[PDB]
Design a protein around this ligand. Sequence first.
Ligand SMILES: [Ca+2]
Ligand SMILES: [Ca+2]
Ligand SMILES: [Ca+2]
Ligand SMILES: [Ca+2]
Ligand SMILES: [Ca+2]
Ligand SMILES: [Ca+2]
Ligand SMILES: [Ca+2]
Ligand SMILES: [Ca+2]
Lengths: 289, 289
Amino acid sequence: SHHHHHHGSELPQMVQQLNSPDQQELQSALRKLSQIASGGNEQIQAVIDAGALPALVQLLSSPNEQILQEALWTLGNIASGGNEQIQAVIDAGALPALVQLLSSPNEQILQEALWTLGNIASGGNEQIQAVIDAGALPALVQLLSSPNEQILQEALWTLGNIASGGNEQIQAVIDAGALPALVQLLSSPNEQILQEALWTLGNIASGGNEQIQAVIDAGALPALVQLLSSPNEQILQEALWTLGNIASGGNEQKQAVKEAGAEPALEQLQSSPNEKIQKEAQEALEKIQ
Amino acid sequence: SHHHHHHGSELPQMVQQLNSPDQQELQSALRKLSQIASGGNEQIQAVIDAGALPALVQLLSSPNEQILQEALWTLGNIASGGNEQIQAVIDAGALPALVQLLSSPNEQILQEALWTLGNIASGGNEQIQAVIDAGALPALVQLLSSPNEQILQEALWTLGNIASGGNEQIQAVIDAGALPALVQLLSSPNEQILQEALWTLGNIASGGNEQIQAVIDAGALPALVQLLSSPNEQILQEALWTLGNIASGGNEQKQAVKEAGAEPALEQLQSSPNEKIQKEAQEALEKIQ
Ligand SMILES: [Ca+2]
Ligand SMILES: [Ca+2]
Ligand SMILES: [Ca+2]
Ligand SMILES: [Ca+2]
Ligand SMILES: [Ca+2]
Ligand SMILES: [Ca+2]
Ligand SMILES: [Ca+2]
Ligand SMILES: [Ca+2]
């Protein structure tokens, strides 16, 4: 099922009502805009072109959480469209307000802010760079020690998105000090945390030799080889993939994987019922020959 | 809330399963892909990159409607992403298969085909031109005579989307003979149809002097002035808007609006409770001086 609607003098009136001193008129317009921004790129574009972004960004400073959550939601949805749409969010000045929100004692606000930064960081290298230049990395890395598993997964995802940019963007992640926190997380008894940390680490390990060498130095290899003993097949797959990425580096990084005791563990996984596990294990093992 | 997932050897496997002779395995994969394609641009991009498009396009020839409806749904969702994502749908050869579906006696398939086509025509001029070149216009124009209000609304939207492009693509719609059918639709007692028609016509009237003149020569002006008597405020709004578009042309187009007796009907509407109606009526009247 699908409804079509034309815009629309309503949309600017909607935008105009974000500055309205009537909070329920305000909230009604706000909910309406978030609903529209949750459609296609076409819909998202209509919200942008109606000039919603400056007003939405202003609301990120509100001491009213009801207003704020809905505005964050709207922004996050816009940032799930095209790169130029993500860019319009950045141009509107959303990033400094988003970063400031990373220190919120409100877990709902914090996760929504992280989720929105994540969406922005999911775009092109231009958009990723803006997040870094806005200064998100230090608060992001700090959140890696969070005892809150829900906040942790959200920070891991955003960091991973940042780390899927060019080699210089990955390096910014490494330089903000993400690697010791991640490596530590590889020691968790929580398989869900492991999958999340490996997603991010793997993105880092897919960089150039300098980025890969940093991963080696932070002691990721022993932890990765330990995970090759995991009964959980998702973990095996992520750990194999991360390792395969390291083993795609130079002779130096390859030699490091060889010295890490990975060959026995890989040789067993080569005889696995799981086809994905069988494959990545065979390949990882082959690259380091 | 929001769940994240890292792809994933599964995605190519799901793609590889579109060609599986196991129909339930095929359906399972198919439904999984469409679910993923209904996420952000990030998610849509993953489906494209996994190479689902060539396989999805093949399925558009299947005599199995269950398979076909789900593949259509999947393609339409991809076509609701960025311009280059639409482009990837076109580059995979979807358009000729879509246009052939416009002759389907199955209303479900037909509406989904139009919907997907509509999503493609919502992109840039480059994407719109490919729909035109694929030969969609003749069937679309024919559907304007359809006694099915549901099929009708879907054809109106897709044509409207085409008509939102450059003056040349608007011209292409005019040349396929859309204007007589639209003008006929302006005589409908069905206000829902009127709105849909006025959306399409208004888009055509936002073209250059050539395209505006074609609208005037199709006899829209009497019909539009008649609609300025409507008790329905949306209809008044769309008709005022369409008319304001015509009155944004050259002196000759403006002269024609004067000659069509729009003067007293506008002046009446200049004293109206509705602020949008008040405004567009006032402007239109001003342009034709
Ligand atoms: Ca108040
Ligand atoms: Ca408060
Ligand atoms: Ca709290
Ligand atoms: Ca992206
Ligand atoms: Ca039928
Ligand atoms: Ca568009
Ligand atoms: Ca009917
Ligand atoms: Ca009626």
